Amino acid sequence: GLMQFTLPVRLCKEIELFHFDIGPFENMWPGIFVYMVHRSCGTSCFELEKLCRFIMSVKKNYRRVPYHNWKHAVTVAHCMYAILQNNHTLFTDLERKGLLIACLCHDLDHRGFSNSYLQKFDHPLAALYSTSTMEQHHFSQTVSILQLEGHNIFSTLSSSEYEQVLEIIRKAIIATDLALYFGNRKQLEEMYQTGSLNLNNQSHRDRVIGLMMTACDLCSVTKLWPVTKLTANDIYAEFWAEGDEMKKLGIQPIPMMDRDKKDEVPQGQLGFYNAVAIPCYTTLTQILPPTEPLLKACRDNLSQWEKVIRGEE
Ligand SMILES: Cn1cc(-c2ccccc2)nc1CCc1cccc2nccnc12
Ligand SMILES: [Mg+2]
Ligand SMILES: [Zn+2]
């Protein structure tokens, strides 16, 4: 009850900033998450024993893959913490509760393979979930862990509040399917520009939370350059292993997943910044002005990839 989590001074200050990196000490990440819940939600949001048990069962259900691992889960939750703390009064009590949990759980039991590889392999999950295959699985794994004995962190909510928080989590996790991002952002662009965007409209709040989820999920592009650049190594280590597995099924992978085309990474990064990342943070900044530092950091990193192409690094 009177038991706050506290961080060393450097972490206490830098965790408030969008570009914070959670460090290489895996044993500090649970404490960092509980710290973020306590400040963004409250010390009363969750029973500490139940929250601690939930966190450790979530950790156990992330795999030892290069990128889609427990460090990614906590990194994506931190970017959501920074958005929530910079937009104090815009979000409901249930949204605060649901969204950090959603971020921690959003890639549960990821195998390091895309939806497209599961469909080509004919994985059983591709028959159970025909679209957003991995994301339906991540939500299914989240409900499983919530139903373990002593893992119900939402136990104090009414039956209808419980259904509402699980619906926030489900939509927030499905929104992390990048295939769905393009259309969501275009609709938000039109709504903002014609002045029809209304944050009391539930279907509009859903779209804005979906964009927050894309923004948090892609947040490696908003870090200091050395973090951005070293995270890109882990991203491609997964993609290139998927490309190898495409070659084993007798399918030429796309260049993004073919280790033989490593030389083209710098130009592939430019495409990605221009087609996905910069548009994401641009629309997010229009809707939520205090998220502008994410956009500024993304533009700084585009400029670094442009230097790499010019042979200036
Ligand atoms: C599009 N695209 C193409 C290529 C490419 C590379 C090599 C040869 C040919 C094409 N790389 C990307 C972006 C990779 C990428 C994908 C998803 C999330 C990412 N989040 C951060 C940084 N990158 C991310
Ligand atoms: Mg994912
Ligand atoms: Zn993710």
Distance 239 CA to ligand 3 centre (A): 14
For 3, list phi and psi in degrees, rounded to 5. Answer: -100, 85
Distance 107 CA to ligand 3 centre (A): 5
| Structure obtained using | X-ray
Q: What is the largest CA-CA distance in the chain?
A: 60
Check: CB of residue 97 under 8 Å from CB of residue 164.
Answer: no
Annotated binding residues for 3',5'-cyclic AMP, as ranges?
Answer: 68, 269
| Ligand 1 atom closest to residue 264's alpha carbon, by position in its atom list | 8
216: CB partners within 8 A, 6+ apart: 76, 77, 79, 80, 83, 103
Any catalytic annotation for residue 68? Answer: yes
Closest CA to 239 of 218, 253, 217, 257: 257
Tokens representing residue 187 in the block: 């609709």
Tokens representing residue 77 in the block: 């939750």
Check: CB of residue 114 under 8 Å from CB of residue 55.
Answer: no
Tokens representing residue 248 in the block: 């084993």
Closest CA to 292 of 300, 281, 303: 281
- Map out the domains of the chain as residue ranges: 28-310
Check: CB of residue 79 under 8 Å from CB of residue 18.
Answer: yes
Q: Per CATH, which fold does 28-310 belong to? A: Catalytic domain of cyclic nucleotide phosphodiesterase 4b2b (1.10.1300)
Cα Rg of the chain (Å, integer) = 19
Breaks following residues of the chain (C-to-N distance > 2.5 Å): none
80: CB partners within 8 A, 6+ apart: 99, 100, 102, 103, 212, 216
For 16, list phi and psi in degrees, rounded to 5. Answer: -80, -15
**Number of other residues whose CB lies within 10 A of the CB of residue 133:** 21
> Ligand 1 — pocket residues by CB below 6 A?
218, 220-221, 232, 235, 255-256, 261, 264-265, 268-269, 271-272
CA–CA gap between residue 305 and residue 301 (Å, rounded): 6
**Residue with CA closest to ligand 1 atom 9:** 256
The alpha carbon torsion through 209, 135, 18, 278 (nearest 10 deg) reads -80
Q: How many CA atoms lie within 13 A of 227 on its CB side?
A: 19
Check: CB of residue 280 under 8 Å from CB of residue 185.
Answer: yes
Map residue 43 onto helix, strand or coil.
coil
Q: What is the DSSP letter of 79?
A: H
**Number of other residues whose CB lies within 10 A of the CB of residue 234:** 16
230: CB partners within 8 A, 6+ apart: none
Tokens representing residue 51 in the block: 């929250």
**Number of other residues whose CB lies within 10 A of the CB of residue 262:** 10
Residue type at 89 in one-letter notation: T
Distance 2 CA to ligand 2 centre (A): 36
Query: What is the dihedral sign for C-alpha 249, 251, 253, 254?
Result: negative
Residue among 115, 238, 256 to mutate when testing ligand 1 (max atoms within 8 A of CB) = 256
Point out the ligand nearest to the CA of residue 272: 1
CA–CA gap between residue 173 and residue 210 (Å, rounded): 8
CA–CA gap between residue 58 and residue 106 (Å, rounded): 10
Q: Report in angstroms the alpha-carbon separations of 121 from 17, 124, 290.
A: 41, 9, 43
How remote is the C-alpha of 304 from its chain's centroid?
23
CA–CA gap between residue 73 and residue 92 (Å, rounded): 23
CA–CA gap between residue 189 and residue 286 (Å, rounded): 9
Residue type at 295 in one-letter notation: L
Residue among 272, 274, 304, 308 to mutate when testing ligand 1 (max atoms within 8 A of CB) = 272
Q: Where are the alpha helices (DSSP H) in the chain?
A: 9-14, 29-40, 48-60, 70-85, 93-105, 115-121, 124-128, 133-146, 159-174, 178-194, 202-217, 225-248, 265-272, 278-287, 292-309
Check: CB of residue 165 under 8 Å from CB of residue 94.
Answer: yes
Annotated binding residues, as ranges?
Answer: 68, 72, 106-107, 217, 269
The alpha carbon torsion through 283, 288, 294, 295 (nearest 10 deg) reads 40
Tokens representing residue 302 in the block: 């585009």
Check: CB of residue 120 under 8 Å from CB of residue 251.
Answer: yes
Map residue 235 onto helix, strand or coil.
helix
